[PDB]
Amino acid sequence: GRRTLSQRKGRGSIFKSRSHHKLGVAQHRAIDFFERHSTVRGLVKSIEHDPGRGAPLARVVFRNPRQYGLDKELFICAEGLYSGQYIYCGSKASLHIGNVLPIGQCPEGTVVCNVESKPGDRGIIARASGNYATVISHNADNETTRIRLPSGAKKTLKSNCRAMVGIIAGGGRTEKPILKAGVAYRMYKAKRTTWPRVRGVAMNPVDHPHGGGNHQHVGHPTTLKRSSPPGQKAGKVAARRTGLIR
RNA sequence: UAGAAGAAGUAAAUAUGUUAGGACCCGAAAGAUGGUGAACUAUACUUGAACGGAUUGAAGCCGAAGGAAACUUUGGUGGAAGAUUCACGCAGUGUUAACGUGCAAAUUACUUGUCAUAUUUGAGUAUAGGGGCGAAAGACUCAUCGAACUAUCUAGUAGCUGGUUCCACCUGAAUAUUCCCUUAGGAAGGUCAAAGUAUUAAUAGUAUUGAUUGGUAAAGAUAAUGAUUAGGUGU
């Protein structure tokens, strides 16, 4: 046989990210004393559209708590932010939309976004459009707090992990139905090469495990073990269930 | 059942036979190893270039009239759409036209379709052979692709096909038998040739006389086993 399309994706030749017009890395600012024990105030200069992602980006400008100059940051917009707004980052920040607070200071039930899975790693969870994470409970014995991830899973993080209060802007993006093949083509302008997807049953036995015979069909069960080698791992992987959900 | 029984062997040059090597000469599709290719084509990115004329008329907006209201009727304006068409171009539906030792190792003529957003296109750049790339035809990867090109292993192997070079003279065949992964082929054996011997209980594809063997042709059918048409006599 040949090497299937999923195998050719891992080499990254034509499947490299189309990130040329992107604004940059969107994250919190690097942790320091002034964020651990004080608050630094930033100014939302503008709100910009980052190619390839559905949420807007804010060009915040903190000043320089230790030197002279400007610290041009690049945050992910929370819904409701506006140009010229002031936002405060630090442990003593007020509980307002757009402010950055350690996850331990947020009252149980607070909605946050752009949460750090580890202290000081500048944002991991709840970064897509309209997404958010909820603080479940605190644990002052070992300085851990429980949050509910947007997928529904519960995760325990350190109580000093930072997060931004609010909802990532641009929600309800995927509810608008794409209508045309051309529109879907334009969606991957600043993404990887994946769109026009040929069914495995339409390929040939050399190309794909599904490449069939005189009738377009699979032939063998499409639920496979997690341990299948790359090359035959095509279809549902480690499927605990199948069929329409009730 | 090997041996001994007053030793025969050895050396070298040829000829013939067996055997290994390119192996009488030429012939595979294949396999492995190392390199060269994206000047053709495939996809993707960077930076450039290229929409002229018509058709239809969506939101949005304005007037008039009707209405308690909700709003409706009517006339305009507007210029959307992977909307309809023509042109520069492009493709290749049909003639299964031309040509078919061509203009051309895929072109020409008319007809047909298409002719800016999933568009067309230049340069740069990236992806390499059990790999790439593929809106998927096993398609494309320099006229080479159901695994490119190039060189080495390599004069690859062939029970299969083709060829195999002077004269006279003498002798002159085979298709049984056994075994084989055997059936287009081999070894044992038969037929044949050439060398070399032995005075030789070592002649016969013949007939006769004598003693035998066998169960074929024929013959038989209340002679045994069967098959089958009738007629008398007795109970």
Next chain:
RNA sequence: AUAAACAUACUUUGAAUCGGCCAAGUCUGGUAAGCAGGACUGGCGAUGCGGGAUGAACCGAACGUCGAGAUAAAGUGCCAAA
């Protein structure tokens, strides 16, 4: 009884060969076959010559180069010798 001394008995080494085919006062399967397969012998293969007009197998007869005669199968109206 007849024949047999270039009789007889061989020994060694080795070549090619084991695709066969035909005839019949023969046989088996088949309706049958210029079909398929066998017993015995003679042939073609390996083979020309004379005759059957022509023909791998039929009939006579097998071959160094020639001359003369008697012949064989078979023929004798012309082609064609009688």
Next chain:
RNA sequence: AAAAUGAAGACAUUUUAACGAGUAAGGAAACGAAAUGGCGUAAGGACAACAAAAGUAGUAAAGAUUUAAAGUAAUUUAGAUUGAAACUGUCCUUAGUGCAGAUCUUGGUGGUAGUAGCAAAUACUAAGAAGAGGAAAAAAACAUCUUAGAACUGAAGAGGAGAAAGGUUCCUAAACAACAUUACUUGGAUUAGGGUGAAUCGAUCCUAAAUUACAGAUGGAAAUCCUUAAGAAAAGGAUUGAAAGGGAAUAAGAUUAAUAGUUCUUAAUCAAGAGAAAUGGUAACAUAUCAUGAACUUUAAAAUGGAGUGUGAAAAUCUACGGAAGAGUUCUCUUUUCUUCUUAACAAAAGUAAAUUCCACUGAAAUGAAUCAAUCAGAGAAGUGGAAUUUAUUGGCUUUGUAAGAAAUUCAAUGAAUUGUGGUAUUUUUGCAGUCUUCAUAAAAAUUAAAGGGAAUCUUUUGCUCGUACUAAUAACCGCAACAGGUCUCCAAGAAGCAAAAUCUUUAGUUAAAUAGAAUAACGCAGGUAAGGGAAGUCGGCAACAUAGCUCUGUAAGUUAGCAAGAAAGAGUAGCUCUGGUGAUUAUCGAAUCAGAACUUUAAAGGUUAGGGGAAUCCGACUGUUUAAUAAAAACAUAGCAUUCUGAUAAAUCUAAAAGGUUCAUUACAGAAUGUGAUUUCUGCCCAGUGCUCUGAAUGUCAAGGUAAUGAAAUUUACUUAAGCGCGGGUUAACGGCGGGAGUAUAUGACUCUCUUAAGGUAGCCAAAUGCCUCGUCAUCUAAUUAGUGACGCGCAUGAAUGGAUCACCGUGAUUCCCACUGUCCCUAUCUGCAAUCUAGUGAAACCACAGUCAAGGGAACGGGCUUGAUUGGAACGGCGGGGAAAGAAGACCCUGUUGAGCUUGACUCUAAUUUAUCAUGUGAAAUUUUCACUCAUUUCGUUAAAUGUUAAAAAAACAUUAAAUUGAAACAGGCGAUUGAAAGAGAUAGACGGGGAGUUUGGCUGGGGCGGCACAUCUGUUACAAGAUAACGCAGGUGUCCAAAGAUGAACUCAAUGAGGACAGAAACCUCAUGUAGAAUAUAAGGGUAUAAGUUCAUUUGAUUAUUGAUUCCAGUACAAUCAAUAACUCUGAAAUGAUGGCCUAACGAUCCCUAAGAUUUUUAAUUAGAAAGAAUUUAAAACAUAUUAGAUUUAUCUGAUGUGUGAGAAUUUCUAGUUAAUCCUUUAAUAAUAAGGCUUGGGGUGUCAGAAAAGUUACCACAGGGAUAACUGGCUUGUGGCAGCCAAGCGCUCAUAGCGACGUUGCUUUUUGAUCCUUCGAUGUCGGCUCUUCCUAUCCAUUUCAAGCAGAAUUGAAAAAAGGUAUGAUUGUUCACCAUUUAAUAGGGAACGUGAGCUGGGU
């Protein structure tokens, strides 16, 4: 062969006799009576004038051409001519030693053949010049240049220029041997010269996608990774990457045979250099340098998509008024028609614009302002007055300097003349303004300026390196070339029109671009027309005809309500003369557009351009893509729908490895893996099987390890270990699946019974692109329907995200029917151009054993050659497609190879990735090794390693720095800050999983292969032919066993059946007598054998045993197996002779290696006792240390010297008899021991393909070596079957066997069906039907002539002569065939390689 002779003769002796064919094959050399005889090629060693100049040769070698001679032949010899320097004969030796073939290799050359051709791109003609090169009885044509005529490209060009590529092709002169399919005086061709000028155009500079270094990391290696992260490297990050991106600065005229934003004249610009620090304006803001402005920081520019509308300006075109100069027309007119009337870079500022944004005064409602559209206003409209920016350089346009001195148009013979002003017109270019659109937001750096801050106190010089010629294509580039193919751009006139369309023309370019002339045949290619009919042609309206612009009227069903729709359908349209509407400015001026009216004619879109329309069915929703070179589609994509996994140190996944890489500059509205394919309606039941999974169970099965026991030890044994499987549950929008039979209300069967699945196919749909039967049944379409449509449904074998049903719009998709139109057709005629024909010049190729008249025969079963006939005159031109089983190609179909390759799978054997367990020693603790606590290796991260730890002390989009006065601005820790953490990663070993991947295999026989069978090891009878052998996928059957008795022996008895008797008792129970040759039994298939037995019964027993020989059956006289004959033991039975080494006989079975059992003690040795008999033993140089005894040292398992003796020494040993002890089948190679292992002999474990590999498929994507050893087609033999014909006569025919038929039987012919065979063809004979056309047969359908009848006439029926002439048109189907509707005198049947493909078609296959 035998005799005779035999040192040398010679002819390989003399004589006599017999013999002589031959494919494959053999006979090497030498051998005197020669164990075959010789010829030739080349080289090596000798010999070649015997008397001291010793083979031939310039008095002509080798070679070549021939003429003759010798030899059976291979070959040799000699002469003649040519040739001019080496060569030959004999003997041995040696070998790169003899050619007709290999689709042989290389080179050369023929026929074809003066043949096919030298035919796209409209086109040339006259006069003259130059030249050898238009002559001549028309030799009808003539290359280059100039002039004139006539033309084409038609300004998206056949024009003027660039990028790439080419590389001197550029310009000129001389010259034409070759080349540009004739020629050339021409040339992009030959020869020789000349030619490319930059401070301003580019490269150079910057960075994009990307690329590459030192050090570092990885690797066995080559090398790979990393690109600023790891670095004592680089205020911050290295190299390269654009002649289309960014970018300091030049223009006009003139000049050269050719270079020019490059030279010259004139006129400019740019960069680098040289000679307590300003005013004005209310404000927006403004001032020939002015008017200081460091570090540091920020902002902006360079630098940002597309569409569409409006509009400013310039240019081009057109036009209004006024002219000046020149040109054209002019016997008909034309105050006429045409040309010229221009201006740069850089700067200036008389005059004067459009649009946008801001500033000041004021404060809008009765709301206003404005655009084509919009849009805006108390965070302030409108108004008035101002400021700024943009508009191809200063400042947009006119104007000005440059500058008229240039340039253009004229005139004179260098010198003179002129060079106004406009437009509410079109196009192009370039800006501007707002509007729309994106799940698309549409680059960076070099480089420049400004600001915040307040540190410090005009002239002139120079401008380097490299490119610069030319083409840029119907001749300079890539395709072998001057190739009708391909290749990126800039500039762009008139007519007409909606139009950059078609058509014609101006400026420019060219008239040649693979040759022409004559004639005007066939057959063609390209373009046409056609009476009457109108698809009747055909697989099919293929091809062609037909519709075609604009205006007005009108427009259906269906529908996703958007469409259908340009639906369909109808009318108008010309020319000329007029009339009216639509404005600007304030009476004058201007625009093409619309409407209307008289009149005339050839009655009007049509020169060119320019939709045929309608009714339905299927598939796909749509726009899109696709097999470059036979498939453009129903296939792929698509939006929509659905499922699975993943919290990122993850999922997927590349890599040998890696602080390695991709999605990821990412974070579940995300990433990755799949199925279905818009919308509507709906997705039924099944978890048994195979997958997937579980948050699940332990003590079923499971490895290396770990622990323990025995033993001298290896070894062995036991216990305990993870995943995996098993056990239990879940899951089908996971792979997939979704039944039978019988009664029952003139038929059907609601109903009932019964069998048993995991579930029994549900809603739907249907002879469907899915239905064999089948051309299903009923309607409809037609005259006629294997076609279409609508219905029916026990549906071979429909059916629900393998998606079911439904269709609106859409489609170079498949199918049917109507209208219109027509040469598709009846049925062909005719016209034009280019060829073909002939000629001058020029000039190939495929192919070719030799060749070329027929019939029949035979033959390899279809001859051009052979045999017998028919017949023949030599050379051929134009056509032609019958033949040459014509050419092209080692058949691609089929088969065979112990030949492959792609693909698939629990085929066999493995393997990367995944996974589980153990080992690989961080500290300090607890529980029964586990659980904890820590960090210290380790992992994953973050930053400018920027306040770690412990003490101490949401009103405002603005600024924040270089400090004033060691502090100000606190100290210390041996932790840059977090995170994980002794667990996880990488290594080793072990178990599981693993078509993701690698290697390989897939028996044989065979009336072709496959399916079927086993004729493959094997027995009986028969074919089988009276010895032995012996065929078929011949016939009838049989084996892979069974038996402690069914082996051995002894004894007794006689069986099957029948008759006659005997209570129940009978046809069959048990008893008796008689007859009883086996008709019973003997394990089994069949055939043999058997009567005081080989059968039945009784009794004893284990010979169904050990060892050794010799034979017989298959046989190769191998093995296995079997069948016998003896011998030596120990036994069984019998009184005994005998019998017994399995079964009454013919089948009942098995190598090498490997595993596993049994046996090798009968005998031979050593030592020591007692007895006896023979026995001299070889001869000088010495160290191992067993040690004692001393001289030193030492404490530890204590060693280190030297003195010393024996050892170890040499001037007994064997045999034998009787004991005793011990050992005893051989070996593990220095000697022994107990374990272990290996030998030797004999059995068992098995190969059934049975003389014995370890082995699944599919190729319609296929490949190679071959095959007529072998199938699919013709032909040939046969004729079962198909067709036709006879003989007899039981009967039918109202009576009557034979008018006409003829049963039960029986004899033939034919090759028009299909069989049966495999003879020819596998380095190829083109395989169905139809169309066209010719011929042949008669077994005759019609016409002609006759006979018969159950023939009155008519219509008919049977038969004879006769094959000269006729034998049709359509619907459906690819059909042959068939079935319908017609018509006719009849609408007969057949052959010719199932006639006919260099004759067509391509419907089917």
Next chain:
RNA sequence: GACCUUAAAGGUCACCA
């Protein structure tokens, strides 16, 4: 027709040309 099964009846095969 061939193979299989039941108490005649069914079931699978019938292929490359």
